[PDB]
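Work Package 3 committed the consortium to producing structural models of liganded targets before the mid-term review. Because experimental data for this complex are still outstanding, the team generated a predictive model from sequence and the ligand definition alone, so that downstream docking and mutagenesis planning could proceed in parallel. The input record is reproduced below exactly as it was submitted to the modelling pipeline, together with the SMILES string for 2-acetamido-2-deoxy-beta-D-glucopyranose.
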Amino acid sequence: QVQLVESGGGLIQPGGSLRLSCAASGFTVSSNYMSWVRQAPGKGLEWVSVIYSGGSTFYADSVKGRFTISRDNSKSTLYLQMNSLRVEDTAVYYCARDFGDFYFDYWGQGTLVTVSSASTKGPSVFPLAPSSKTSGGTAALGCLVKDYFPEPVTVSWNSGALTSGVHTFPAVLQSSGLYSLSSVVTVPSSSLGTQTYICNVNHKPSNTKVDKKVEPK
Amino acid sequence: EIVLTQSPGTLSLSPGERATLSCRASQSVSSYLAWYQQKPGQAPRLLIYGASSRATGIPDRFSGSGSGTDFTLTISRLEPEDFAVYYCQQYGSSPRTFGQGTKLEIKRTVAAPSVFIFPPSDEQLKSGTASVVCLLNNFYPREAKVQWKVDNALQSGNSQESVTEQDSKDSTYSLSSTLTLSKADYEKHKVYACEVTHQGLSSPVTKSFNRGE
Amino acid sequence: NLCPFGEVFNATRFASVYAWNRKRISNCVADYSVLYNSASFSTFKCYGVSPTKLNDLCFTNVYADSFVIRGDEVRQIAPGQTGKIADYNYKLPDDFTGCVIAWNSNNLDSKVGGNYNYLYRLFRKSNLKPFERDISTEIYQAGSTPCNGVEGFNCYFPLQSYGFQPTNGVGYQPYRVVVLSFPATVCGP
Amino acid sequence: VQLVESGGGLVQPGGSLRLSCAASGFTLDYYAIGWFRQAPGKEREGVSCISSSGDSTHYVDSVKGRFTISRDNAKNTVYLQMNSLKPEDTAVYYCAAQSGSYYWCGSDWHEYDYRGQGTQVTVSS
Ligand SMILES: *[C@@H]1O[C@H](CO)[C@@H](O)[C@H](O)[C@H]1NC(C)=O
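The resulting structure, written out as tokens with the ligand in place, is given here.
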């Protein structure tokens, strides 16, 4: 039973450095080929680096000179050191077990590397109030989670109780370089006076936690 | 740098049917071709290697064929858990390369969106920006045209769309269009309208509001 | 006595790279200008010498190593290279003195449906030393549970076939390779 | 070590181009140099090669009378004179260098080790 968990990803500025690590169980890392494969958001997979079972290392041309793959068998850990980072290095990075430098038969879960000059900023949460006019006996309400960086945020409704009809949209990068997002949910209009609706927005890169009560105007 | 071209970009079928996904290489890669599955928010899973060998624990309905420059993944008796993105990967020449993916989505009956519009909160207006939101709830197919009309003028360049992944239960989509203005520009207009066209609508639907009511 | 280079280059069958062949060339006169001045060899690289002046030099004695690898691996048969062939099959030292010759052998070593006779070593925990030959077929233990001689999970056969077909792209086609490593008993004319 | 192609681009039917492959990072004396063309949506084909001996071999029928390959070891470059150009000749042209035996020339792209990234030749009509 193989298991791989990557960690270390976060926001860095262009030129900065970052060391990703990948904990492994189910095999011996020092006698196996291992690879780093990255996926830029909304895009496809790009091979980054491979370390052979004997210790030789190879790198995509995009990253040769500034990335170094390494491993510690004592800790059963694979490492990707990254220096002189550029914006086009932004991606989820996966650690993968490599069968003879041919294909990737086991993958970790991925750790997100964001390279950007923009600075950490917590969201502002604004209500999306149900209109008196809604259509079908059901009413929509929500929270606009605007101008945060970097990804991710988590949104829940009534601290996990309300999940039916909840759509938390993918985040969008605006021109400023900050992310914006919305969470909406459909409820009975009957329940607008009776029931309370509160969204719980969490953004750990900036330690922001907002609980905003959404309610009619 | 062998380029892998995947086809089609999107494939829309229903459970029980047959899916045929093609990968085409800019150079011969012999049998050195692999297939991967990726569900949203998850990692790739190896499915096929050596063009035709299944990975450990992969069901029999998955099977690869082809060689040289043309390869096919076939999923014979589709099940809900099978709708995901599929990647090919050559290892004939270095560097190893992936295709750009083929997305397999569940085909359902046409469902029209229910449409809502939200004016900016007073609290956000205090900050000096106004965000108007239009929501297209629970529709299919994914393609829909949203069009902002401010005092009947068509508003271009100032809005952004987001779309959920296909709902696991009813296979529908949701869309948000967000129109962002400064408070100064927001208070130069009266009527904000979201106009929506879709296959499930006999004629476009407009939801609108008047600033300050 | 003239050096038996035809027996090396023109041999009916070549060795697989993991079990590469090595022939000593001793007390004969050698003509290397026959080899260099032809249209035959797509690779003919010399290190420490010039191909021009190969005949008018003398060596203690010479070794002719030979094997078959695919074309895009022939570049691994050079000093300082790394890769599966250089790490686990045939390794040249960093200070190598000699010549490396290779020609396409698709018309000799390819078979329809695949020639699976040539093998290379895929798995190994340490790199070979220069001029090491490793012919063990031990199951490779890539995990912690011992293999006890049966392939399965984390237990792989260390060797792999090339499977040369005549319809492969020429990058994947078989190439025959001869490496020439350079009192004194071996001289030119 | 790099191989940069130049001299191509737009040209009229009947016009000529002079392609230059400039090699850096190594000297071209022992190397044979080949010129290849890739037409829209196909794989590369060998056009013509010169060996370390300086001898030429042209691999396309269409191009024997028209193209002439030349080598300059002192300036470290190789030339392809293309006369009587036709719409059929439009392609991305690459050059490649391979260290073989004296008279060796190769029609096959995957048999050269050093490769250029290519230059576009477009002929009207
Ligand atoms: C090998 O055979 C060829 C063809 O008969 C011959 O020309 C050549 O001299 C022989 N020996 C060597 C070393 O190539």
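Reviewers should note the following from the model. Chain A has one helix and 19 strands. These observations will guide the Year 2 experiments.
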